[PDB]
């Protein structure tokens, strides 16, 4: 057919570091994510629409969005600063993407440096800003010593503001040699005082946040020609945000002892009088009582003197949200102790639309399930409705529509406002021939038995509730039997089910397991092979009540089961394929000369013993698609596929003699998702240029019950379901 694409519905699942309301047009808003692109708000549907699904495999780094700006002068314009890592993990430089149709189409201005959409400090901002009087002028705060950058042609071209005196010097984790935690977080927000410009004339007063505990805020009063450190400013902290109440003339800084978004153990809120230069400590709590940093800063644009902030890094018992209606002289908070451990809330929290946010937890007071939140760097009051606010957490977007009930001494209602955001990273996917259509393995929220692809599942896997599921499998001939492995701070790292994943019980494990690795289920459900991180390959008869070390197979090998012969298991490591014919007790080395470097994914064919498809490799070594029909003794490399990364199967086409094969691959010079109904003799692309989703290499499977349907992994855009 032509294909249509949709998410298997989950609602959220990831960190939303920034939410942006346009300051001139009611109900125009956007959200940015750290690995999953950017979204525009749909008021009529109370949902979000993805804007960057066109970002392709070779430019996957552009799915990280470190900043977004919505033009107040011309609300049709929106800009996004993109790029994911500044170390070797992201091979492409950053860019500023520009749109003049609210994100429907984009052009890219590539920068000569990398950006950090998924790096420490990504919750600070916004560091991309448009001049609110002369909207051809934009600024971008840059990391890694690149300083402050500027465009004077509406984002088409960029150069460094060499007069800016401080490129930053703060790093989260200086001992890190990987480049992930030791980067200079640089310039972290830019805020204009729109009172200091006029239509078509550059705004003269510009405020800039810098990741430097001794010099965290600078300003210009001559339109960015010269810059100076603001005298009298607080020291010892990083300003996560700088927001100006133009009605009272006060600039507010929410400060933290770290760059966030995960850490922060101390904080203040300080206030600067832009007319007199006075500084005042307006913190909601005393320095000695702040065990967290502040962020989540927002001013009510319709109510001068009203503002809010968050304890963004308060992990226990909950996050905290503060509100002042007198410019920070006095505050109240969303919840209080009323004689510890008892607590009183100014809100009710209702997650019936996203029930898994309970986390399956049953905490004692003062902790609640669900929680008010965590990692709350983003909090925004609707500039056109004092009764609405939205805030981001590490798993969702929450909001309320009766916020001013707070001031009345009443109770306001908080619900998810996240529908449409699909932000999970997918590790594995399985579609069994009976039971639910899909079992997913996900980062951060474990994964789900999806009984309905169009409905939010009630709860993630529990007993155990793993942070991330790295691998799952089902018994081909007995799909009631399922196994999953994954990551957690504590053992157990493995769970079993005999009711198709609806309910679970833990397995035991060998000592030294540090992560899930991969797991495989015997075709008859009688036993399992587990290749964990931190320990070697083990096998078990029964539901992992004890494990025995497998011989003849390298630690860390990728393991799979035959789908027909319950005694036959497979392994792959460093270019060598391994086979076991005794339930995983002993392996022998078989085919060699497979990719020695790079990711590999492989799966055996439902219905046929010893028919194996194997995809993988890398840009700098062997790369392609291989097939064996002799249980891995020999493989043939497909002449039709230049590169391939994931491979999986679904129901045969009408009249076809072989199951349908799906791959994420590069075929005939084109990266995409492809389908074959003639056992790989020919291929058809089934996605398109608008539906690419960056790195789709983790997993793919068809559906044994539905011809043409495919489930595709993404790294930040959830589970993509393609249907003809
Ligand atoms: Ca360290
Ligand atoms: Ca699997």
Notes on the protein architecture:
The protein has 724 residues and is mainly β. The protein folds into 2 domains: 1-12 and 424-724, YVTN repeat-like/Quinoprotein amine dehydrogenase (Methylamine Dehydrogenase, Chain H, 7 Propeller); 13-423, Methylamine Dehydrogenase, Chain H, CATH 2.130.10.10. The protein is built from 1 helix and 58 strands. The strands form 15 sheets. It has a 5-stranded mixed beta sheet, with no helix packed on it. Strand 40 and strand 41 (527-533) form a beta hairpin. The longest helix has 4 residues, at 405-408. The structure holds calcium ion (2 copies). The PDB classes it as hydrolase. The entry lists the keywords Hydrolase, Xyloglucanase, Xyloglucan, biomass, Streptomyces sp. SirexAA-E, GH74, Glycoside Hydrolase. The assembly is monomeric.
